[PDB]
Amino acid sequence: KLHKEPATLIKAIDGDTVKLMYKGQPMTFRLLLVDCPETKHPKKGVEKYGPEASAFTKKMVENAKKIEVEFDKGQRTDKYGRGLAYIYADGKMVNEALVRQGLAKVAYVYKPNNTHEQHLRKSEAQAKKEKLNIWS
């Protein structure tokens, strides 16, 4: 059974990366199942909707009363040592909000870390249907 744990904001880094205090230690978290356009991309750099994705995540976590982290059932860190998690801001999943707003696409999925895959794909289809941001 997945479950949410408390965490404390340190700072928002990008649309899909946030630094959090978790069980007492600073950690970088990568949001599961979503790909945002980049502001600091390995190759290109500041992609379109990048600054917007990043402002969205930032406001959402900066304005919350409570942030919670939810690990999936597979590996909890990636090769770069980032935690892989669903992030909640006052009970609202940041990963889904981004997708619902057309500020992220659903990423390539790796079982078994795919528990919220269907909900997100459904929000992505609606953002597409409404032609929002990335889908316009």
* Alpha-carbon gap, residue 27 to 46, rounded angstroms: 24
Say how many Å lie between the first and final Cα of the chain, rounded: 37
Question: In the chain, how many domains are there?
Answer: 1
Active-site residue, 38 included? yes
**Identified catalytic residue from 5, 38, 52, 62:** 38
Q: ∠ CA(113), CA(118), CA(121), 5° rounding?
A: 105
Active-site residue, 82 included? yes
Indicate the resolution in Å: 1.7
Looking at residue 77, its amino acid is: T
User: Whole domain around residue 73: which residue ranges?
Assistant: 1-136
Can you tell me which residue has the tokens 């997100």? Answer: 120
- Do 62 and 9 form a contact (C-beta atoms < 8 A)? yes
Torsion of CA 125, 17, 66, 73, to 10 degrees: 70
**Identified catalytic residue from 30, 96, 100, 124:** 30
Count of residues in the chain:
136
| CATH number of the domain that residue 120 is part of | 2.40.50.90
The continuous run of DSSP H or E covering 62 comes out as helix 50-62
How many other C-beta atoms can be found within 10 angstroms of the C-beta atom of residue 68?
Answer: 18
* Alpha-carbon gap, residue 14 to 29, rounded angstroms: 11
Can you tell me which residue has the tokens 């990335």? Answer: 134
**Identified catalytic residue from 47, 70, 82, 117:** 82
